[PDB]
Each structure stands twice: as structure tokens, then as C-alpha cells.
Amino acid sequence: PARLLIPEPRAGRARHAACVLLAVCFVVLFLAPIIRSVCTQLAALQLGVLLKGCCCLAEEIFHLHSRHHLWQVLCSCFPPRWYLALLLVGGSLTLSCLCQLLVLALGLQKLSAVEVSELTESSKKNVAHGLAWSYYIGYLKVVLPRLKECMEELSRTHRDTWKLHILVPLGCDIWDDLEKADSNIQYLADLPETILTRAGIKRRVYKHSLYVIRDLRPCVLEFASPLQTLCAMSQDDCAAFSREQRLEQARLFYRSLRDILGSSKECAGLYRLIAYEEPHFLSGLILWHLQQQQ
Amino acid sequence: PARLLIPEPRAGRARHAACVLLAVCFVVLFLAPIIRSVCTQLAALQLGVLLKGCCCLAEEIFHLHSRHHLWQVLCSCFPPRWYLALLLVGGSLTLSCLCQLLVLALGLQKLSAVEVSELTESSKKNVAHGLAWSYYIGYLKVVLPRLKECMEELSRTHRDTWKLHILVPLGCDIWDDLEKADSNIQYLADLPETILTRAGIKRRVYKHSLYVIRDLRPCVLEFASPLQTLCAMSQDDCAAFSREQRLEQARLFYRSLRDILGSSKECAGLYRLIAYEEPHFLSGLILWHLQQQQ
Amino acid sequence: PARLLIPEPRAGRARHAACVLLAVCFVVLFLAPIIRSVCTQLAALQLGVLLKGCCCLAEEIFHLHSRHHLWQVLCSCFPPRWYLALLLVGGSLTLSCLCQLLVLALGLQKLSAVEVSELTESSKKNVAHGLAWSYYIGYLKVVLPRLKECMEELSRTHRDTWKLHILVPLGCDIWDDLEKADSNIQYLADLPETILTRAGIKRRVYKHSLYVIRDLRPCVLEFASPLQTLCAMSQDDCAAFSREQRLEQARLFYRSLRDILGSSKECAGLYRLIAYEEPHFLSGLILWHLQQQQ
Amino acid sequence: PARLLIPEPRAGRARHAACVLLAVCFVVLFLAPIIRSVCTQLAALQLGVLLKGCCCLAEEIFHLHSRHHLWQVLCSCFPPRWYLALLLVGGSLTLSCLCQLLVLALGLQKLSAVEVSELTESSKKNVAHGLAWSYYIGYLKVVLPRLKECMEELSRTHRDTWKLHILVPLGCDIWDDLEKADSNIQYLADLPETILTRAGIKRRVYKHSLYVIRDLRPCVLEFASPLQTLCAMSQDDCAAFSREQRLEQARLFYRSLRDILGSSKECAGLYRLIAYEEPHFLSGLILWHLQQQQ
Ligand SMILES: Nc1nc(=O)c2ncn([C@@H]3O[C@@H]4COP(=O)(O)O[C@H]5[C@@H](O)[C@H](n6cnc7c(N)ncnc76)O[C@@H]5COP(=O)(O)O[C@@H]3[C@@H]4O)c2[nH]1
Ligand SMILES: Nc1nc(=O)c2ncn([C@@H]3O[C@@H]4COP(=O)(O)O[C@H]5[C@@H](O)[C@H](n6cnc7c(N)ncnc76)O[C@@H]5COP(=O)(O)O[C@@H]3[C@@H]4O)c2[nH]1
């Protein structure tokens, strides 16, 4: 199997390194008269933060009813601990205000790549987490409990392997015809369908397929579909989206899906996530996962 | 029809208000000796930004190969115009460094609601835009060109109305049985299906339905499905997601879908977005949209 | 008809404004001892220009036979009036040479948008002029004299309208099926073909089509084809090409084609350039051009 | 085969030679008091660049809506790093301004041959690259996948040679009758045609031809057509275009076509670029390329 390097979540040791550098710099400040001097700089920052809120009253007043329907807007305007800044302003000029305005005009407070990356993958509001929730709720929550009955119905036409391997290709190749993927992968038949009236559509139909892979074992197998969506979210270039970020979002999607099916409760063992990169081959990986459980 | 208040995109007039306040404050500074003093504050900011990059070398060194595979990491570490800060540091102490570290330790640089809102909806990497791209590529790109032929095939069993009204309920109510939605809405039949081998599944089936609404007109009609996903992304509470943000994300989804089908090229006039809030009724709105085109 | 804003050629009034500002600044220098001082700056420029030529001997010596097959290279190296610089250098140091080299190293002589725009559209070597020459020589020079005979041959199966309206959509929409463009535009038949042995291909075939547009008039009509090429020169993104520059290049193409058919001598009145932007409609514009000549 | 000398792309070693001459001149300046003197010359340049922008406000104000529809114009007016010039102007007269205006009036900033050559072939907006994109998209993208089927259809009336040799004569001779090119080249038959509704023309027809060359081998063969366009872009003299630049543009065209078919993905091996100069002969070169693959 190929080496799976998916990124871990952020541990948050940067604050620890900042604290250590703070303590070391205080020790070198060792080897009372200057503490007031600290305040002469400190509220100098906390003015400008307030200034940012003042400018954020600018556009938000054009969004009163359409986004916020007064006190809600000013509640949303500045960071929530606003009284510390005024508390520090009271404990004491135009140069500071003009410097903060000269910063805020030219826009030199642009965050870097790693900061927006941690802000993206920290919140659960990016593309990959929402799309993984869509794939979990819309498909996997519904089909997977009805898998064993259709398997038994085809059985009247190996109980360890009655699962649903989801191929998750961390990359670009997504194929509709898996018989073009290898000469070893062969189509045999399909499962009995599933009929559900979902979201106004009456009798929506979910299907499957059964693939026999030999040298001599059957399995159910399909691709994780919405990666295909990402495959058109950068090729068509109508979304601001790059290939390196495409690989990043695919790894994030596999990580989020692994997390969701980790704390899943209905999906007992019926799923089996197979993920890979491009280093024939795919049948060899399928056979390795298939023999691994036995 | 109900009043549709969807939020406009950010115009960006806050920078203009900052510039105006800058010019006015410079005029009051009117009515050369102090400009060097500006630099004594100015690089005082640009040190600390560099300090943030120093702390962002901390956790990123635990993410060398798993996210970035040296120079790529330091390239991603600080904001890209790094030389202006060192240029300003050269033009001239421990108090400034300790103040910036004391800020970065306690974490008082937390962005407000409106800043993270503009950062979210500014980039095309939130939940609603990616999910709208999924609904456009997976379903609307495929089905809609094959609509007229199925309509003509049922016609051999009103050409102005041969469309697909997508009900987009900006709210919480999403129903599977539209006959429970009103006594006026009646199910009649379904369109001939669509069979496509998509993403490894052989013979995936797309269906539709035809609803006759009288007092005396037929139409095709369905719900925008993945809003249902959002309806379970906060009720189950396994995602950090609120109801006010649910209404916000639904309005954002309708806006993004309106934008995508605005610049669409295959979907000629075959879609017709109907969106509403909860103020019987739904049939009255459907009849108003249906009579509006004629 | 929509308002056609195509850009005029460059008149060249910027040199006039420079001359006026020169004369005014000389008048303020009024209200002999300093003229030598002028030379102390003046050759200071004309050294560095020579320096640019010295650095342009660098890469060109790697291109001796492959691009230039000595005296040809140095002839091509610097600007052609080289003796004025040495003439000014003789009339009199290391600071000037080091300043010019410090400029040429960091590359601060990067031209702006308007300068490269005037340099592009000034020379007849851009994309749009060459592609318009291709469309004039390859197609319009050959087909158009043989139009009336094919029209008369279909006439034995309104002489004011026997022309070839070339639709030039200044934009993005280019359609292969003009019957999908409007319900009013209808296909009737095609002209008799044209057979020519061109560029090694024996019996290359040129065709046409005849469209009847009613409410009750026929016309010949086709799209300006190579705009489609521009439609794939930025969407596929394999060329450095933007949409705003796509609209600019399309307007430039229509202007160049209008110029070429202006001074044309074989194409008497048989062409009729119809161009438009996107504000049904297209048939209305076609009927307006069709009724305008009568 | 004749020696193919096509020009390589610009490597960019001239900046390296400038940097080396800078370092050597600094070393001779070795073997603090003068650095301010540098600035007394340095902003003396950066004023005049700003002056160029001032004069470029002159004609552009006559092009407000017709090319740019204020802030867009001034954004396009000067080079984008405008603040460095004012930053250097602040760190300190009429002689400098009058010298820069006296330069800009007489127009002694005319670029040389090699500078406009690198600016032309550097950007992808010259004649040859756009015309090569036209020949790739309009013809080679469409015909070449349908080649093998027509070859097999004539085969039912040597699989290594089923290709399309494009003759690219880097020169002036382009002939319509290849049987006049040599007694050895003989016409036999033509391929089955290709019918496509392209750009409003219904049933546009693409053809081919099959040439048997003996002493005893067949091949498909045609000329690169739009070189013929260049053959009329200087002979008719309606475009500013010379014969030496004609050979240069032809070599540039062959290089760009070689690059495009290098990164091509549909055209597997079906093309085979044959290019030559004029030193019978052409059949000998064709036979050498034909025997080379076997
Ligand atoms: N009304 C309706 N009838 C349909 O048959 C249908 N099929 C898809 N869709 C909607 O279009 C989109 C395309 O599916 P996508 O591939 O992007 O992810 C889909 C897909 O990965 C998976 N899935 C759903 N149905 C099938 C199916 N029949 N076969 C395979 N996978 C399916 O579950 C994901 C989410 O489905 P929904 O989020 O409930 O609505 C889908 C989806 O929004 C449908 N909508
Ligand atoms: N409407 C229409 N019907 C035609 O039959 C036709 N034939 C040519 N053209 C247009 O005129 C011009 C002349 O072709 P050129 O030789 O300069 O390069 C042409 C030519 O090199 C090649 N090509 C296209 N069709 C053929 C063809 N039948 N035979 C050989 N070569 C062809 O592809 C190039 C680009 O074609 P288009 O860029 O899509 O439009 C062409 C072109 O703009 C046509 N336009």
C-alpha cells in the first residue's frame, strides 16, 4: 500500500512557543519603572482595534435590514471584549490614531497562507466538511442499513466481505467505467434497488453494482462521487480553486469522512474506506484490502 | 409575493470611510518634524507581524512533509511583502517586542463577526458555494438538456411552461410529500427516466414528477434537495451551526445558485428559481410564478 | 441598435501635452549659466541607455547563428542613434554608472498597461490583426466573388439584399445552431458549394446556408468563426489571456476587419458587418440591418 | 536532413551579467559618505517615470468610456509600484524635471530591435502564437481523433504509418498541386469526409488526401495552411511585414506548434511535424521521415 500522508489537525503549539519566548525575553529584561511605559504602547494597539470597529460601522449600515434587522449591528461590529480597550485608553495621541488609520487605509493587515488555512480547516464551514456531511446524510445514512438484505436477496440467486468499499482517489483520475480501470475488474450484476420518496421526488431510486475480481472474490464497490465535483470546480475555473488546493481539499474530505464514520452509530462495519494516491495496480490494492479483513 | 431580502455582496466602502477620516485627521493635524516619529511607531507594528511569522514557524515545522513537503514552508509562513517590515526596522526596542509578544500570547487579535463573515462569503470556499456547485454540476448540468424530450414523450400520451421550477424554501420546512403541502397540489405521473453510468455506478437513474395544480395548469416541480442537508447540519448538532446562520447560509445558497445559473450557457430558460420565506399559500405562489411568464 | 463603443486609434496628443508643460516650465524658469548643468544630467541618461545595449550583448551572443547569423547583432543591439550618446559623453561619474546598473539590475523599468497597449495595437503584429488578415485572405477573398452566381442558381429553384451578413458577437456567446438562437430564425437550404485545390488538399469544399426570417425576408448569414478561437484561448487557460482583454481583442478584431474591408477592392458591397454586444433580440437586430438598406 | 536552426526561448542571462558588472564596479568602488549622493540621482530617475504617467493621463482621458469606463484609468496609467517613487522624492530640482521633459518631448526612449523582439515573443499575443492556436483548435483538435476510422474505411477498399504529416515549409514556396512538387509524389484518392455544424454553417466539410510515394509506401500529407496567409501578409504589403521577419515568424510558428502539440493530450502520435528550409528533394525528405519511424 502507498504511504498515506493526510494532515493532522492543528495541535496549537505556537502559543506555547510564544509563551516561552516571552518568558525568556522577560528573563533577559531582568539581568517596575517601565511598566507604565508598557501601557503607553499597549492601549496604542487597543485604540486601533476600536478604530477597525468604527470603520466596520461603515458598510454594515448599508446592511441593516438585509442582514441584521441597531444594537444587533454594533453587537456584531467589534470584538466582544470591547471594554478592555476603553479601560486601557483611560489610563494615561493623534500620531497613534493617524498611524492606525494609515495602516487600515493601505491594508497591510493581510493574513498569510497558514493563518487562513488554520481559520478554514478550524471552523466546520469549509467546502470539504459540508460536502462530506452531504455525502453522509444523503447517501450513506440511507442506503447502508438496507445493504445486507439486498446482499441476501442476491445470495439466493463470504459473509465477512459483505461491505461497501468506497474508492476515494486522492487525486484527479475518476472513471465512470471501472472495467476500463483494469482487465481484472469485471462487472457481474447489480443489487436490488431502493425506492424512497425524497425531497418532493416520488420514487427516487438508489442502485448499486457487484464486481467480481479474480486471479477469486466478489465485492461491492463504488467511487466517492462528489470528488468529481471538485474535479470540475477548478478545471472549468469558474471557482477560485487550484490543483494543490484540490489535493489539499481531497485529503481534507477523506479526513472528515473518516471522522464522521468514526463516530457513526448506524454504519456498523458496512463501510470500508479505501483511499490512495497515484504512485495493474488498483485491483492489487482492492485485493489487499479484501484479504486484509480475512 | 413575499419581500425577498437576500444580502448583496460586499461593496467595500469601509476603506473609503477610513481614507476620508485619514484626510480629515491630516487636515486637523495641519491647522515635517513629526514624520520620523511616525516611523518610531510604524515599524513598531511591522516588527510584531514578523513575530507572528516567527511563531508560525513553530507548528508548521511539525507539518513539513505531511502538508508542504523548507522554502515552501517559509514561503507560506508570513505575509508575502516581508521586505517592507525589515526595511522599516532598519530605519531607526525590547519594550516593543515584549508588548507584541504579550499581545500574541493572550490572543487579543480575535476577529469579529463581520470580519469573519466577509472573509467567509468573500472567498469561494464556504459551505453554500461548494454545495451549490455540487447541485449545479451533478444534477442540473445533466438533467436539464434532456427535459424537453421527456416532456414531448409525455405529450404524446402549453410550451411556455415546460420548465423545472425549483422550490427553494429559505427556512426550515422541507417536505417529502408535496400532496401534504396543500390540497391543491396533486400528483399525476412521472417523466420518463434518465439512465447514466456515473462514478462507477452502472445505470444510475434520474427521475422526475408532474404536478397538476388547478382552481387548471400543469407544471414540473421539485425541491432544492441539499437544503435538507443543512436541515440536519444543526439539528443533529454534530456541526458548529446555528439557525440564524442556517437562514444566512440558505440565503447565500440561493444567491450563489442564482449567480451560477445567471452565467450558465446550457440551461437556457428551463429553470425557474422560486424562493420564499414562511410569512393555502404555496399553491398561490406557484400559480403566481406560473401565470407571470404568460 | 446597441451603442457601439469601439476604441479609436491613438491620436498622439500626449507629446503635445509634454511640449506644453515643457514650454510653461521654461517660462517659469525665466521669471545661459545653467545650460552646461543640463548636460551634466543629460549624458547621465545617455550613458545608461548605452549600458542597456552592453547588457543586451549578453544574451544575444548566445543567439549568433540561430537568430542573426557580428555586425548584424551589434546593429540590432542598441537604439539606432548611438552616436548622440557618445557625443554627449565626450562633452564634460562612477556614481552615474552604478546608479544605472542598480536600476537595470532590479528591473524598475517595467512599462505600464497603457504603454504596452499602445505598443501592441500600434504595430500590426498582435493577435487580432493577424487573425483578421487570415479571415480576409483565406475565406473572404475567395468566396465573396462567387456569391452572386450561386445566389442566381438558387434563384432558378430581392437583389438589394444578396449579401453576406457576418455576425460578429462582441462577447462570449457563439452558437453553432442558429435555430437555437431564436424561434424566428429558420433554416431553409444551402448554396451550391465551391471546390478549390488549396494548400495541398485537393477539392476543398466551401459551403453556405440560407436563412429565412419572417414576422418575411431571406438572407445569407454566418458567424465570424475565429472569435470562437479566442473563446478557447482563455477558457482553457493555456494562453495568458483574460476576459477583459478578450472583449478588447474582439473589439480590435472588428475594427481591423472593418478597416481591411474598407480599403478592399474585390468585395464591392457583398459583405455587411453586423456587430453587437449582449444588452427575441438577435432577429430584431438582423431585421433592422435588413430593412436599413431598403 | 537539413540543419534546423529554430531560435530557443530567452533564457534571461542579461540580468546576471548586469549583476556581475554591478558587483565588480562596487569592488572597484571599494579599493557611506556617498550613499546619500546615490539618492540625489536615484529619485531623479523616479520623478521622470512619474512624469511619464502624467503625460499618459493626457490621451487616456480621451478614452474614458470607450476603453476603460476614473480609478480604472489611473490604475492603468503608471507602473504599479508608484509609491517607491514618491518615497524617494520625499527623501531630499527644476533642472531634473526639465531634463526629463526634454527627453520625453523628443522621444529618445525608443526601444531597440532585441527589446521589442523579446517583448513580442515573450508575451503570448503575437501573430504566430495566436495563429498556431487557431490552427490547433479549429482543425487539429477536430479532425485528428477521427483519422483512424477513415483510414480503416479506406483499408477495406502498415499501421505504423497511419499518421498525418504536416509539411511546414520554413520559407516562401507553398504549392497547391503537390504533383507539381515532384514526379515521385502521386495522388491516389481521398479519405471519407467529416461533416460538422460549426459556427452557424450547417454541414461544414473537412476532407483529406492520400499520396503514394514510391521508388513503395503510402502516406497522408498536407501543408500547414496559414503560412500561406503570411505569404500574402508581406507580398501585398498592406501589413508592416518583411521577409526576414517572415522567416522569423515562420520559425516562431513552427516552434509554437511544436510546443502546443507537445503538451497535447488527444493528439497521441497521429501528427508528425516535418519542417525544412530550401537548401528531387522533398520526396527524399518525406521518405526519410517515413522510414525513420520504422
Ligand atoms: N431530486 C433528485 N433526484 C435524484 O435522483 C438525484 N441524484 C442526485 N441528486 C442531487 O444532485 C446532486 C448530485 O449528487 P452528487 O453526486 O453531487 O452527490 C450525491 C451523490 O454523491 C449521492 N447520491 C445520491 N443519489 C445517488 C445515486 N442514485 N447514485 C449514486 N450516488 C448518489 O448523494 C449525494 C448527495 O445527494 P443529494 O444531496 O440528496 O442531492 C443530489 C446531489 O445534491 C438528485 N436529486
Ligand atoms: N464558415 C466557414 N466555412 C468554411 O468552410 C471555412 N474554411 C475556412 N474558413 C475560415 O476561413 C479561414 C481560413 O482558413 P485558414 O486557411 O486561414 O486556416 C484554417 C485552415 O488552416 C484550417 N482548416 C479549416 N477548415 C479546413 C479545411 N476544409 N481544409 C483544410 N484546412 C482547413 O483551419 C484553420 C482555421 O479555420 P477556422 O478558424 O475555424 O475558420 C477558417 C479560417 O478562419 C471557413 N469558415
Tab-separated table of C-alpha atoms in Angstrom, chain B residues 73-253:
chain	number	residue	atom	x	y	z
B	73	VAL	CA	7.069	26.471	4.362
B	74	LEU	CA	8.778	29.834	4.884
B	75	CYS	CA	7.184	30.975	1.635
B	76	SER	CA	3.805	30.126	3.144
B	77	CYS	CA	4.690	31.397	6.618
B	78	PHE	CA	4.470	35.218	6.741
B	79	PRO	CA	2.554	37.710	4.542
B	80	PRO	CA	4.231	37.985	1.126
B	81	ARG	CA	5.531	41.558	1.380
B	82	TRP	CA	8.051	40.741	4.088
B	83	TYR	CA	10.799	43.125	2.992
B	84	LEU	CA	8.860	46.294	3.871
B	85	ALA	CA	8.970	45.325	7.552
B	86	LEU	CA	12.745	44.823	7.622
B	87	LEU	CA	13.155	47.986	5.542
B	88	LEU	CA	11.270	49.882	8.228
B	89	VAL	CA	13.135	48.144	11.067
B	90	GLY	CA	16.458	49.313	9.634
B	91	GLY	CA	15.379	52.953	9.645
B	92	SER	CA	15.870	53.941	13.283
B	93	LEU	CA	13.021	48.347	21.454
B	94	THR	CA	12.708	45.434	23.866
B	95	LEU	CA	9.529	47.098	25.120
B	96	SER	CA	8.026	46.850	21.627
B	97	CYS	CA	8.941	43.178	21.250
B	98	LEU	CA	7.618	42.334	24.708
B	99	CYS	CA	4.392	44.219	24.006
B	100	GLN	CA	3.820	42.346	20.753
B	101	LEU	CA	4.602	39.040	22.453
B	102	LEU	CA	2.264	39.897	25.314
B	103	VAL	CA	-0.439	40.529	22.731
B	104	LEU	CA	0.258	37.304	20.834
B	105	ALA	CA	0.339	35.194	23.994
B	106	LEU	CA	-3.068	36.182	25.330
B	107	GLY	CA	-4.701	36.172	21.895
B	108	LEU	CA	-6.438	39.542	21.773
B	109	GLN	CA	-6.287	39.538	17.957
B	110	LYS	CA	-9.584	37.707	17.586
B	111	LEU	CA	-11.609	38.832	14.588
B	112	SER	CA	-15.193	39.987	14.981
B	113	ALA	CA	-18.380	38.626	13.430
B	114	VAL	CA	-18.428	40.902	10.391
B	115	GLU	CA	-14.764	40.288	9.570
B	116	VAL	CA	-15.094	36.512	9.526
B	117	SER	CA	-18.380	36.936	7.644
B	118	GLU	CA	-16.738	38.951	4.867
B	119	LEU	CA	-13.785	36.559	4.845
B	120	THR	CA	-16.170	33.612	4.524
B	121	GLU	CA	-18.504	34.916	1.826
B	122	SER	CA	-15.659	36.695	0.012
B	123	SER	CA	-13.726	33.535	-0.774
B	124	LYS	CA	-15.453	30.853	-2.812
B	125	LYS	CA	-14.660	28.155	-0.270
B	126	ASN	CA	-17.585	28.206	2.187
B	127	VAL	CA	-20.334	25.601	2.524
B	128	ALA	CA	-23.040	27.170	0.374
B	129	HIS	CA	-20.953	27.918	-2.720
B	130	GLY	CA	-19.431	24.446	-2.861
B	131	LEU	CA	-22.775	22.792	-2.259
B	132	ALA	CA	-24.352	24.964	-4.957
B	133	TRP	CA	-21.592	23.901	-7.337
B	134	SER	CA	-22.380	20.300	-6.423
B	135	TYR	CA	-26.062	20.802	-7.178
B	136	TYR	CA	-25.232	22.523	-10.453
B	137	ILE	CA	-22.726	20.011	-11.783
B	138	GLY	CA	-24.193	16.764	-10.501
B	139	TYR	CA	-27.850	17.328	-11.333
B	140	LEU	CA	-28.712	20.486	-13.258
B	141	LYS	CA	-25.924	20.159	-15.802
B	142	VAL	CA	-27.065	16.655	-16.695
B	143	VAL	CA	-30.853	16.502	-16.486
B	144	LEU	CA	-31.994	19.886	-17.874
B	145	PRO	CA	-30.878	19.409	-21.524
B	146	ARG	CA	-32.890	16.181	-21.638
B	147	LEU	CA	-36.072	17.787	-20.284
B	148	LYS	CA	-37.910	18.758	-23.476
B	149	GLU	CA	-37.674	15.290	-24.998
B	150	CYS	CA	-39.268	13.630	-21.973
B	151	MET	CA	-41.892	16.380	-21.934
B	152	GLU	CA	-42.691	15.661	-25.572
B	153	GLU	CA	-42.813	11.938	-24.860
B	154	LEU	CA	-45.391	12.538	-22.160
B	155	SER	CA	-47.046	14.978	-24.568
B	156	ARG	CA	-47.895	12.070	-26.866
B	157	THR	CA	-49.707	10.322	-24.010
B	158	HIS	CA	-48.521	24.907	-23.083
B	159	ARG	CA	-44.988	25.081	-24.436
B	160	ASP	CA	-44.316	28.289	-22.494
B	161	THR	CA	-44.397	26.454	-19.164
B	162	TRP	CA	-42.209	23.423	-19.992
B	163	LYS	CA	-39.658	24.256	-17.328
B	164	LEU	CA	-38.390	22.997	-13.980
B	165	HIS	CA	-39.406	25.189	-11.054
B	166	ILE	CA	-37.021	24.527	-8.192
B	167	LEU	CA	-38.686	25.301	-4.888
B	168	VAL	CA	-36.107	26.852	-2.588
B	169	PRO	CA	-37.666	27.317	0.860
B	170	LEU	CA	-35.489	29.830	2.686
B	171	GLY	CA	-36.237	28.350	6.069
B	172	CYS	CA	-36.784	25.045	7.837
B	173	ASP	CA	-39.850	23.355	6.309
B	174	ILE	CA	-38.841	20.774	3.707
B	175	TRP	CA	-41.437	18.138	2.895
B	176	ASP	CA	-41.151	14.875	1.031
B	177	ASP	CA	-44.880	14.610	0.255
B	178	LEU	CA	-45.957	17.716	-1.624
B	179	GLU	CA	-49.528	16.456	-1.550
B	180	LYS	CA	-49.392	17.091	2.204
B	181	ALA	CA	-48.255	20.630	1.418
B	182	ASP	CA	-51.633	21.639	0.021
B	183	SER	CA	-54.895	20.119	-1.082
B	184	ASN	CA	-54.463	21.894	-4.417
B	185	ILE	CA	-51.166	20.238	-5.349
B	186	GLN	CA	-51.892	16.857	-6.904
B	187	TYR	CA	-49.622	14.125	-8.204
B	188	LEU	CA	-50.388	12.917	-11.715
B	189	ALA	CA	-47.479	10.974	-13.232
B	190	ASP	CA	-43.724	10.981	-13.740
B	191	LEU	CA	-41.417	11.703	-16.632
B	192	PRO	CA	-39.501	9.001	-18.491
B	193	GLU	CA	-36.284	8.329	-16.637
B	194	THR	CA	-32.637	9.029	-17.419
B	195	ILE	CA	-30.006	6.284	-17.268
B	196	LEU	CA	-26.328	7.179	-16.961
B	197	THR	CA	-23.239	5.302	-15.802
B	198	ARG	CA	-21.864	7.841	-13.343
B	199	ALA	CA	-18.920	7.442	-10.948
B	200	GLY	CA	-18.645	3.669	-11.074
B	201	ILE	CA	-22.358	3.065	-10.555
B	202	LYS	CA	-23.713	1.474	-13.698
B	203	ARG	CA	-27.181	2.679	-14.766
B	204	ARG	CA	-27.814	5.432	-12.263
B	205	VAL	CA	-31.414	6.581	-12.639
B	206	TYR	CA	-32.714	10.150	-12.538
B	207	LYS	CA	-36.477	10.653	-12.349
B	208	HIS	CA	-38.968	13.492	-12.089
B	209	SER	CA	-42.650	14.126	-11.447
B	210	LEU	CA	-45.512	16.093	-12.955
B	211	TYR	CA	-47.919	18.022	-10.739
B	212	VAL	CA	-51.260	19.413	-11.878
B	213	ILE	CA	-52.385	22.481	-9.927
B	214	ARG	CA	-55.916	23.693	-10.532
B	215	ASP	CA	-58.625	26.012	-9.282
B	216	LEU	CA	-56.062	24.456	-14.267
B	217	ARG	CA	-52.406	24.109	-15.198
B	218	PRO	CA	-49.636	21.510	-15.106
B	219	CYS	CA	-46.012	22.002	-14.153
B	220	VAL	CA	-42.881	20.140	-13.203
B	221	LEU	CA	-41.738	20.905	-9.687
B	222	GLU	CA	-39.246	19.714	-7.089
B	223	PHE	CA	-37.393	20.900	-4.013
B	224	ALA	CA	-33.801	22.022	-3.910
B	225	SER	CA	-32.587	18.918	-2.119
B	226	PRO	CA	-29.336	19.790	-0.253
B	227	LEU	CA	-31.029	22.383	1.953
B	228	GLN	CA	-32.293	19.245	3.697
B	229	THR	CA	-28.617	18.547	4.433
B	230	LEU	CA	-28.369	21.916	6.168
B	231	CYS	CA	-31.569	20.984	7.998
B	232	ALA	CA	-29.606	18.136	9.564
B	233	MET	CA	-26.323	20.017	9.962
B	234	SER	CA	-27.599	21.911	13.016
B	235	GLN	CA	-30.494	19.844	14.394
B	236	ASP	CA	-28.199	16.876	14.993
B	237	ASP	CA	-25.686	19.457	16.346
B	238	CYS	CA	-22.662	17.450	15.215
B	239	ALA	CA	-21.525	20.540	13.290
B	240	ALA	CA	-20.994	24.006	14.757
B	241	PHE	CA	-24.021	25.537	13.095
B	242	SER	CA	-26.866	27.774	14.261
B	243	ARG	CA	-30.350	28.595	12.995
B	244	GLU	CA	-29.595	32.242	12.257
B	245	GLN	CA	-26.547	31.090	10.345
B	246	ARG	CA	-28.822	28.454	8.789
B	247	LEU	CA	-31.040	31.191	7.350
B	248	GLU	CA	-27.892	33.085	6.346
B	249	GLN	CA	-26.434	30.036	4.592
B	250	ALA	CA	-29.739	29.331	2.855
B	251	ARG	CA	-29.892	32.885	1.509
B	252	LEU	CA	-26.255	32.558	0.474
B	253	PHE	CA	-27.075	29.291	-1.288
